[PDB]
């Protein structure tokens, strides 16, 4: 829903959300082909 948000937050007023007590599924992120730059710093994308 963060990725599907119709109107994203402004670049200066970037929305910060703390998420926990759930299961993070990164498989859908890999499956989606819309992403152009998926650079990861300090962590392997595969081991997410």
């Amino acid at each position, epitope marked *: 829903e963060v990725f599907n948000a119709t109107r994203f937050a402004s670049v200066y007023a970037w929305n910060r959300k703390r998420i926990s007590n759930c299961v993070a599924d990164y498989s859908v992120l890999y499956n989606s082909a819309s992403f152009s730059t998926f650079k990861c710093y300090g962590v392997s994308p595969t*081991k997410l």
Partner: antibody
Amino acid sequence: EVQLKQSVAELVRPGASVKVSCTASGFNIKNIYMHWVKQRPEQGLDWIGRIDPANGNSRYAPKFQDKATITADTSSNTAYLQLSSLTSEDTAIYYCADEGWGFANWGQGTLVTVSA
Amino acid sequence: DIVMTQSPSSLTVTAGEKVTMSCKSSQSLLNSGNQKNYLTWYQQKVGQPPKLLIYWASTRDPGVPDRFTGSGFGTDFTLTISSVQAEDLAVYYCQNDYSYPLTFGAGTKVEL
């Protein structure tokens, strides 16, 4: 940022074993299954193999199978590369990796030199 | 095991001139879901290890990002540079990533 400071190259003798340790800063190895790569001078660079911190189950290139064994340390922010039956061809530069879409950060370079 | 052949000979070019180099990739590197090819370019000088020039076959890495955009469906890849500078005087490596057994290319030397 993030840097890979592998151990300085040291002289080795033929028929012996060498352990090369790569250190990382800004994160921990636990989320990084670093690759290992050697660059043969005046020749196309080639990939050695892959390891994992937990359940390493290392897989290497077919040319380096059963010859280059690499182990990953769970702690100390280090990983060790072991070699055996080193020859003159084995004198090459080695680098580390961050197993991104490409090898994001490589080692400074180690010349594993076999001589007398 | 994929045989990767880059441009064999060095391409002597004048400063600020376009270069046409390409490495042919076999096995038709493609992945399900994401259409981005799993071939990543590299930029290696004499003295320091190579760094990612392009990954996913089209993604400008931060730092000296003068084009490097590549148009390829998997069988062929291109890394044309419109203008070559001091930082562009290096050897470029194209490496496959979709196949688990991966090997790098021979290398292409470009100088001003």
